[PDB]
């Protein structure tokens, strides 16, 4: 266990940032419960035992509850993260006996490509004035995934996705439900389910769905 002193939280990069080369994934180290008395806080970033630099470390901000909060951000290499390099933050301070260290890394395990299926609304649903378009994403690993819906360029917004669910074979699956007006579905609009995942060719696949 532990006593008082500052606390540290290590946050991974967002999954979408690790898949798109145009984006920049970041690892983030937050230090809280930093007293006004000794307010010097030092960060040391290790990528598999490798002291790194070029970590944009931000000036301290005074919190409401009277403490100080200090965050350091380390831009990360897509391939390095995706290959399973472990990242590590060490923080040192006068109020600390020993410096604190945390480590994160991509979930271990053999990646597995997801299958994407579009399911049209059921017959009995076609009666209400809103209908439900389903997107089944199954058989993928790890659980880090992004799912979106699209129509004629503009992204669709009245959609909800379930969290990943552990399937029986050790893989995950999820569902995405897009609610549209019945007219739009009957008029013949084409809606699309885009999925981003590291086990996908080009980290991206798109499945379309329209009134047959």
């Amino acid at each position: 266990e532990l006593l008082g002193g500052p606390s540290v939280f290590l946050f991974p990069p967002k999954p979408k940032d690790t898949l798109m080369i145009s984006r920049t994934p970041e690892v983030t180290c937050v230090v809280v419960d930093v007293s006004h008395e000794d307010p010097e806080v030092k960060f040391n970033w290790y990528v598999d035992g490798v002291e790194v630099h070029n970590a944009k470390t931000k000036p301290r901000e005074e919190q409401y509850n009277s403490t100080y909060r200090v965050v350091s951000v380390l831009t990360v290499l897509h391939q390095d993260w995706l290959n399973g390099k472990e990242y590590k933050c060490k923080v040192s301070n006068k109020a600390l006996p020993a410096p604190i260290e945390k480590t994160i890394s991509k979930a271990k395990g053999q990646p597995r490509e997801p299958q994407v299926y579009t399911l049209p609304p059921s017959r009995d649903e076609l009666t209400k004035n809103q209908v439900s378009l389903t997107c089944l994403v199954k058989g993928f690993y790890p659980s880090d995934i992004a799912v979106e819906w699209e129509s004629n360029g503009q992204p669709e917004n009245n959609y909800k996705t379930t969290p990943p669910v552990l399937d029986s074979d050790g893989s995950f699956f999820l569902y995405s439900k897009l609610t549209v007006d019945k007219s739009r579905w009957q008029q013949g609009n084409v809606f699309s389910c885009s999925v981003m995942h590291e086990a996908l060719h080009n980290h991206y696949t798109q499945k379309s769905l329209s009134l047959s």
Binding site: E1, L3, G4, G5, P6, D33, S35, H36, Q63, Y64, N65, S66, T67, A95
Partner: protein, 171 residues
């Protein structure tokens, strides 16, 4: 004949259950006898010893204490407030004037080690300590009045004290 006086060791009239407390008198005794008479909600104790000891304070030990010796009159009562809880703001003085010092203490059930302790005025964090320490304003000011409480960690449990009011006078 002089009026005896009760004194509190230590001097906190607000204590928590299981806290130890010691009352002693300030009155001279006769050559014939050095016996003391203790009362507690006009109930009369039993021991005649000069100091009254409360090992494990219960809620039933709150109330008015007074004492009397052979060559003194009945003491004025002193109040003891035994509260229940995890934390209790205690102070050496509760009455404050402009430029007085404000000494506040965050007392914990059975003196348990307290960590990440925060003293709050008017619902906002005002001073933070990694380890349980006393809060001390050098010289009060009219803006230092408000409701005060203290919170922190009692070994993973996050606990709070009851709030007290604190007004600054004169000026």
């Amino acid at each position: 004949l002089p009026k005896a006086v009760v004194f509190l060791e230590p001097q906190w009239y607000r204590v928590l259950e299981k806290d130890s407390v010691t009352l002693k008198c300030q009155g001279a005794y006769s050559p014939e006898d050095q016996s003391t008479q203790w009362f507690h909600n006009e109930s009369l104790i039993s021991s005649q010893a000069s100091s009254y000891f409360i090992d494990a304070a219960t809620v039933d030990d709150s109330g008015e204490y007074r004492c009397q010796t052979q060559l003194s009159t009945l003491s004025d009562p002193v109040q003891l407030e035994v509260h229940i809880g995890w934390l209790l703001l205690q102070a050496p003085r509760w009455v404050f004037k402009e430029e007085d010092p404000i000494h506040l203490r965050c007392h914990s059930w059975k003196n348990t080690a307290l960590h990440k302790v925060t003293y709050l005025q008017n619902g906002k964090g005002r001073k933070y300590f990694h380890h349980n320490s006393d809060f001390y304003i050098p010289k009060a000011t009219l803006k230092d009045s408000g409701s005060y409480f203290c919170r922190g960690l009692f070994g993973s449990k996050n606990v709070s004290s009851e709030t007290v009011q604190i007004t600054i006078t004169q000026g």
